[PDB]
Design a protein around this ligand. Structure first.
Ligand SMILES: [Cl-]
Ligand SMILES: [Cl-]
Length: 30
């Protein structure tokens, strides 16, 4: 599916909508 808030993330395991990968998924400001 996609990686949720604070889940690990990488090139293939992308963060869910509204988040950005910084090793773990973080909320985007925009
Ligand atoms: Cl955050
Ligand atoms: Cl950000």
């Amino acid at each position: 599916y996609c990686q949720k808030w604070m889940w690990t993330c990488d090139s293939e395991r992308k963060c869910c909508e509204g988040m950005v990968c910084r090793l773990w998924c973080k909320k985007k400001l925009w």
